[PDB]
Amino acid sequence: GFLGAAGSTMGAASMTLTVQARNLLSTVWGIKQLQARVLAVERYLRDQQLLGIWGCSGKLICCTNVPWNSSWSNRNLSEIWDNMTWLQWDKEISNYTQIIYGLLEESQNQQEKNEQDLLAL
Amino acid sequence: LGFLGAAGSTMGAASMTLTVQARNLLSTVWGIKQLQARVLAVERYLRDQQLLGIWGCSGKLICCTNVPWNSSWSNRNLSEIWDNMTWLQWDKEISNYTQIIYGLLEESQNQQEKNEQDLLAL
Amino acid sequence: GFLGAAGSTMGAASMTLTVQARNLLSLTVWGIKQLQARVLAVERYLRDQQLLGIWGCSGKLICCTNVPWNSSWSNRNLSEIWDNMTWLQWDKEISNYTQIIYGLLEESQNQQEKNEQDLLAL
Amino acid sequence: EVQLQESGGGLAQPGGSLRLTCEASGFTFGRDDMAWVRQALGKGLEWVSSISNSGNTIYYADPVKGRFSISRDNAKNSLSLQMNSLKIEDTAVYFCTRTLGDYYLDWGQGVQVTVSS
Amino acid sequence: QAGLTQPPSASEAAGKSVTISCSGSSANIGSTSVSWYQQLPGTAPKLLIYYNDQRASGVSDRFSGSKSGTSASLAISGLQTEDEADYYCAAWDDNLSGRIFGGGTRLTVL
Amino acid sequence: LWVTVYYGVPVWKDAETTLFCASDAHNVWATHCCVPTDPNPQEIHLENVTEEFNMWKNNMVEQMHTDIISLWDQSLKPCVKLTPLCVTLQCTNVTNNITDDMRGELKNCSFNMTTELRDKKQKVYSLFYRLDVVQINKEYRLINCNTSAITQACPKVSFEPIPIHYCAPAGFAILKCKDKKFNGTGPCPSVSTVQCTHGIKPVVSTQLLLNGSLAEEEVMIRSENITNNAKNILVQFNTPVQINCTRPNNNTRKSIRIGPGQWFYATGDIIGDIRQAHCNVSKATWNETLGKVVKQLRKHFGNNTIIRFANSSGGDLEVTTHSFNCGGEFFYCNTSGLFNSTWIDSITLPCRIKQIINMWQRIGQAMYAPPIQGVIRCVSNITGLILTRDSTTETFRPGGGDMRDNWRSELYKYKVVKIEPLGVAPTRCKRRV
Amino acid sequence: NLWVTVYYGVPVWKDAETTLFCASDHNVWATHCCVPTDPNPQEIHLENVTEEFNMWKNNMVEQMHTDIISLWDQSLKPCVKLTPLCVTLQCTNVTNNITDDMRGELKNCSFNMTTELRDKKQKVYSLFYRLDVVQINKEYRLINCNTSAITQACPKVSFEPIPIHYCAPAGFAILKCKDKKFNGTGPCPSVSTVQCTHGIKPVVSTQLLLNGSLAEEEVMIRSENITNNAKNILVQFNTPVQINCTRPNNNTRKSIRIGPGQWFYATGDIIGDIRQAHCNVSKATWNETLGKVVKQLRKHFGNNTIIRFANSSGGDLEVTTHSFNCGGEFFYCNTSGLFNSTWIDSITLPCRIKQIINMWQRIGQAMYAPPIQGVIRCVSNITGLILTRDETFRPGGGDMRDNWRSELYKYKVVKIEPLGVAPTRCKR
Amino acid sequence: NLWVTVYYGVPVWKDAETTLFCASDKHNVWATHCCVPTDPNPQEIHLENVTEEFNMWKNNMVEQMHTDIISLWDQSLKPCVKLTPLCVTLQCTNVTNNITDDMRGELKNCSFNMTTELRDKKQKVYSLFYRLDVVQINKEYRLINCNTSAITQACPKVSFEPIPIHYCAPAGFAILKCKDKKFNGTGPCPSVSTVQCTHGIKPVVSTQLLLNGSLAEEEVMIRSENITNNAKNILVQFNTPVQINCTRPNNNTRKSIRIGPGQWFYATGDIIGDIRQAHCNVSKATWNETLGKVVKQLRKHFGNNTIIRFANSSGGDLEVTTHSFNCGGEFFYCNTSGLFNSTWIDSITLPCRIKQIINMWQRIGQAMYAPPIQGVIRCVSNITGLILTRDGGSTNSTTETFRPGGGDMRDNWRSELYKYKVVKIEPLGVAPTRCKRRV
Ligand SMILES: *[C@@H]1O[C@H](CO)[C@@H](O[C@@H]2O[C@H](CO)[C@@H](O)[C@H](O)[C@H]2NC(C)=O)[C@H](O)[C@H]1NC(C)=O
Ligand SMILES: *[C@@H]1O[C@H](CO)[C@@H](O[C@@H]2O[C@H](CO)[C@@H](O)[C@H](O)[C@H]2NC(C)=O)[C@H](O)[C@H]1NC(C)=O
Ligand SMILES: *[C@@H]1O[C@H](CO)[C@@H](O[C@@H]2O[C@H](CO)[C@@H](O)[C@H](O)[C@H]2NC(C)=O)[C@H](O)[C@H]1NC(C)=O
Ligand SMILES: *[C@@H]1O[C@H](CO)[C@@H](O[C@@H]2O[C@H](CO)[C@@H](O)[C@H](O)[C@H]2NC(C)=O)[C@H](O)[C@H]1NC(C)=O
Ligand SMILES: *[C@@H]1O[C@H](CO)[C@@H](O)[C@H](O)[C@H]1NC(C)=O
Ligand SMILES: *[C@@H]1O[C@H](CO)[C@@H](O)[C@H](O)[C@H]1NC(C)=O
Ligand SMILES: *[C@@H]1O[C@H](CO)[C@@H](O)[C@H](O)[C@H]1NC(C)=O
């Protein structure tokens, strides 16, 4: 049931995130097939690198310390995690994807510096 | 010791060489043959890393989980498994339960993450 | 800027580690030349990630370990290491000890994981 | 240099036999082929038989087929011909010779063979 | 009876020029080379010419020769009374596998 | 609230990627589609998902088109080049057992051709169809001598259509429209996810659509614009019409060496009667089928409108006539007997056979189809039409005109989607550093 | 005590050789790249970074002189091979309207060509330049019949240079030297990091360097060793010298079928006068530009040293003369009038046209350039010289890679190595 | 209670197939292809207490070697001149200048009309051919492959001289080697080791005698897939070499003819000096001793009182019938019967024939033409084994006959690869432990 949660609300749809995760990484045609395989790998790795940068490596659910800006969306949680799907959500905050990612990156850099200093006391 | 030097050592003893084996992975007709070999080495490496990620074992050589052992998979004595036996033998005995075990490890991690998110919330 | 910290001292340059990291990992006969370039970029990336995993540093930009510094590798004090010197200069200063250090980091992680497993058992 | 044909011939009565032999000196016997040439008194020359240096290829002239047999030793540097069922018509001087493709090169001596009452 | 034929005599000259010739067929002279031999009474034949026109070692410029068609010839420019001999031509025959000779031509210098 | 990052989020972007071929359990399709499909399709129904599909802008069609041409060019790559045949031919007629319909269609030609040795020549004869030979002015030449090279197709290579399943690469999926009465564009309220498509036979034809799928309930008419006469109309039947085609002769083949290791396959004498190729369409079935097509056409034209069917306007046979490749021979069929009706026992369609084919409408190359020995009989299903349109009366014609229309009609249900698993949302959670 | 700390993302690099890719703004250069570039590209100045550059061992040059050959072979590979053309020719001179300078240079040759059918022959004729035709002993053959196959270039394929950029693959970077008056070797105190190089036009020439970049301030003179007279000296001008070239004729192209869709493009008749090809260099610009070259040459030769210019030594036209590919035709320009001075209005350089070209120094391959319909006019900038020394300087030319290292001298490829360690005060 | 613990880096493996890459230590094809440097330090890891099963008759490493050799061969010939202008009527007579009598009729002198630089002109040229290259048409002859295949001239600069090559595993794979002396090719091997690359193997091709291979460690080894099924081959590995000296004792002239625009044909011109037959020298005493050792070992499977007889091949095309040998750039077909004429209870001098048009791989469409090698050729090589077949058996005779049957190009390589196996490493696995993750 790979995309079975597409019509579920965001909360319910988050219960089985491993379903989608496991389907990644699953002579003219010599080149066409190598290109297809290389791309699948590069796309996978780019997302993993990004999660590593944010300090989310190894997790499907990563809780961060960057606050939500109501400017991106001022929708209530009862209006987000229920009565709405992930496809709808992705469209609603599509315009803010780049800023959210930049903020997450900066926070991790500060967190690591703070830990390096504490480990020296 | 060497790349497969621990193959004849017992299971317990061989746990001390896990980096020896791990570090040796991921080391115009023939243009294609060589590229296929290189791509394959990478894809195989990543599939193993992805499973460790899903089970919550990423970044570790030895990962202790919270899924209980079912004696129906194996009822050998713990002393018989960790010593007086090799990994090559163990691998055949437990072969038929590999898919089951992997599925259970995945289920456990999904529950664990939810519990952690809720604890961070409180 | 991508290599903007190159002229900064080692301390100051550590403030922007993600700047370099995020820029890594970015039909006739040209198809072979291009596939080779792409495959190589992936292999180099993964080899570094595997190595950090072996040392127990996966997922971190700054990984603090428990392997002591052997002063014979460099007898400079911390004022000179972290200030009044750049990373290019440092790379040359300890180039000859790279493999020694890596071996020690690997050994330490194997001992650490065994100790953690034994503690989880109690 | 020489054949020193050995005079293994002589007088024979019709129906009898003689064995002619030939030596070699100054000649690497084992390398070149050889042949026998017969000359009746008062007549021209005719080919009788030949053998290659390996001893594998042998040819005979029609009038001596069946009756004659040629062989080589290759260790003793010698050659021989066994002539059976001799006839009056075989009276001739027999010559031992060294050959190359399509010509006779080194001839020498010669042995009189007479077949008579 | 010789497979090849040639005149019984060439004793028609003195004065440095005589030609001796012989002939066969396509099964012999026409397909392979021709050699010539000189026989003095009482001895074994000497090689004069081989492979149509090459002189045997020890043979002087007095002797020459050629081949054409299914016939061949020996040219003598000496004709000193020293060149008194029975001359023969020979060639490899393909039907009769061997090196065969003509009748022989008797040459006496006048 | 705080940002929480989730990985494995079920969201989509439209995308264009390269699909790979997979087959079911000598043939070019069989050789190419090496990967077997899994016998069990996923068919995951997506509850409460509505997606927009557009069969006219579907790049899966373009891929199928490009890959088919590519496979054909590779298949003919190692075959003998028939350049020794572009000679003056001395031709008359085949007259031994000609019915009046074949008179003048089949010619007997002789020529001086090369042998294994380049010093020798041989006089040979062969038969040709009139469509393959043009007059020089009894002096004739092959029709492509001043334009293109002729490559003989290899007699051991089969092009018979085998169902092809297109499969997405990892990270991609194919969404399928399960909404009956979907017209090819706009929202589809009922979709499912598959990794591989159903099998599609890579059939090539013009004017009529052969051996395709049928509409689920009713005859359906789809068009990119409908209104603009410049666009075609694709009609999908909900029932097949059976058509029986034949080349009712008895051919023999002869092999002639043209050079070392190179053989030319010539058409030999015909044994028995020489007759015209033809196709049989059941008459009652055809009229019932058109009645259903007309009923549906009226939805866009009016109930007081006269819908007239007529034959094609003319031009090269590739567009003028119906065509197909069956049994290894290339047939060009008249079709006018099928489209002659006002709309306020068998139909026999005469056909012709052509051996030199400019298959992909290109200039540099053409192929020669070696003759097939014996007699050919083909039975196939007409599953649809490619119609064009141009007071109170509208006229419809079997215009055909595009190779790709034979495939988009089977791919209207599929879309390729890129899966993007990473995303964020707010919640009541904070990382404890 | 101090402990080891591992850092990832460390800004260091090592010298490296990798494959760079083609990027750009039926021309073969656009086809080769297929990657839009110059999206407001970035440049990052590196404060306090000194790097060593060496233009004579720059592997970017070797790549450029490998990619260009491959592109040419791929472009000619599918075109008709003119082997039916290597026949005995019966030739006479063209005399209808000849200026004396052209007498004997243009020939009229008749021959028996294969028709569409292999059974028939046709008598056709075409014009050839003398340099393409060699006497057999009025019996002539094409010059390359005894050594190579001649491939006709396809008339629809353009080789006209389009600036291309070289771009680094992920994990690599290109460092640019911004030190004005850098001499090609040693340390460069001012560098920056870039994504791609500036655009470079893949122009091929001999003796004079055409359509390159200009020096920032003065004329720059660079050489691998300077003192070794066996080496070339590259001179980069700080101002262009404009040169106007022409082939002042009116050629008719004619198409002959030589086989089944196989067409040969022959030179047909000429409309109007038949005149010699030539190039115009402003006299008063060649002067001063050359004077600046001399002023700078003296720095390595002495203020009391006389600098003489002289023409080339002789031998094959490909080295002896200026080689220019423009408008689709191949010009060989004498260029003696530009190098005749001792250094104690316009210059007209006669040029010849050759249609059969051994384009790369190879033996079994040659190409035929189809004639260009009408008349050709070219305008180009002389941006530098390739000189040899024996002081007497000559326009020796001789190596195609020198036409590109003159643009690539500012760039270096490096490999980023982000992992490293250092001692510090923390412990795990 | 016990819990599942996941371990990564577990030393286990499965049987597997994968493409191996070549590496090795001029214009040589092997040198150009195996461009990857060899291992300067070929470390071998002994695996204590590991028993593994090997089967040489199912070892796909030989199949890869076979396929890769054919591919390399074809790529080397692909760009060379095609001798199609040469398939003409030839007018031939015999070479008769200085023919020894065993060579008569073997070498022919052929004249023909060939294309010059210009397509308008022909020239009359001549060349010599061996009898086996030319057939009669009915003095009118043609090349033997004109009605089946194209003839491609091998390029004179390309060297096919065998160079030892090593096969190396791709990352994630390993090669296990069997060190059990007297291993018979199948079943368990109690002493194994892990290597990255195989030892060097020379890519030699031969049909009856196995040349320049490795030697058995202690005693002559006899290996066969079945042994008792007479349809199978028997491979014999000697523990000592037999030296064989081969020659083509002539003085060849090479001449070059332009056949087109830079297209050159290399023809055989006049021979200087005598024309003699090619041959091979096998020491008689050495051959008798090593044959005796083979018999001693053959008896283990046939009986101590069973008569063992050797005989020559049954006949047929020279590719199977004779000992095909490629040396000095020439192709030899050696009679070999002098080596297999004995019953078990100085020199041999085997005659050889030379052929120039070779259908090397068992294919029909393409033939290769070997240009002549100028001068005189001498070859010295080691016989390291035999490919024998058995004619029936002792069943109702108490006598068996062995013949130099040959028949499979792969048999000259599996004889070196029998010690190696390719395995796949599978590092991830689980086992119960006395611990639990603390959440
Ligand atoms: C094989 O052995 C033979 C001798 O048995 C060699 O041929 C020559 O034999 C004569 C005696 O008949 C000697 O005088 C020569 O010196 C030998 N030749 C040489 C070069 O030694 C023959 O050459 C040998 N063949 C090979 C390939 O070694
Ligand atoms: C030769 O080329 C012509 C096109 O240039 C081909 O087509 C003919 O063109 C003329 C133009 O005047 C028409 O009148 C003819 O009716 C056309 N022929 C056909 C069959 O339609 C011609 O077919 C080519 N011939 C060959 C052998 O290639
Ligand atoms: C021509 O083709 C034939 C058949 O493929 C070749 O082989 C001959 O076949 C006939 C029977 O049809 C036998 O009687 C002959 O003895 C075979 N010849 C040989 C040499 O074995 C033949 O060799 C081919 N000729 C050419 C020049 O290719
Ligand atoms: C054919 O063989 C003869 C006899 O061996 C060769 O003639 C000898 O050649 C050498 C070298 O020039 C001379 O020194 C001898 O005096 C010649 N001798 C005779 C007749 O005894 C002849 O050259 C050979 N032909 C070829 C083509 O090799
Ligand atoms: C370069 O040197 C100046 C002092 O002149 C210093 O302030 C600066 O931080 C150094 N490095 C960089 C990258 O600016
Ligand atoms: C032509 O028709 C007649 C009818 O009687 C038949 O006998 C003859 O065999 C036919 N020709 C061929 C080639 O079959
Ligand atoms: C040759 O010159 C004359 C005189 O100017 C002119 O009339 C004639 O047209 C010219 N010929 C051609 C082919 O232009």
Author numbering:
A (entry chain F): 521 to 546, 569 to 663
B (entry chain B): 520 to 546, 569 to 663
C (entry chain D): 521 to 546, 568 to 663
D (entry chain H): 1 to 52, 52A, 53 to 82, 82A, 82B, 82C, 83 to 113
E (entry chain L): 1 to 9, 11 to 27, 27A, 27B, 28 to 95, 95A, 95B, 96 to 106, ...
F (entry chain E): 34 to 58, 66 to 141, 150 to 185, 189 to 309, 312 to 323, 323A, 324 to 396, 412 to 457, ...
G (entry chain C): 33 to 57, 66 to 141, 150 to 185, 189 to 309, 312 to 323, 323A, 324 to 396, 412 to 457, ...
H (entry chain A): 33 to 57, 65 to 141, 150 to 185, 189 to 309, 312 to 323, 323A, 324 to 396, 412 to 505
Q: Could you give the paper's own sentences about this structure?
A:
Two antibodies from the same clonal family, Rh4O9.7 and Rh4O9.8, neutralized the wild-type BG505 pseudovirus and were found to target the V1 loop through mutagenesis. We applied negative stain electron microscopy (nsEM) to characterize the binding of Rh4O9.8 antibody to BG505 SOSIP and confirmed the V1 specificity. (C) Ribbon representation of the atomic model of BG505 SOSIP (peptide, dark gray; glycans, yellow) and Rh4O9.8 mAb (green) complex built into the polyclonal cryoEMPEM map, Rh. The model exhibited excellent agreement with the cryoEMPEM map at the secondary structure level (left) and the side-chain level (right). (D) Close-up view showing model-to-map fit for the heavy chain (HC; top) and the light chain (LC; bottom) of the Rh4O9.8 mAb, including parts of the HCDR3 and LCDR3 (heavy chain, olive green; light chain, forest green; and EM map, transparent white surface).
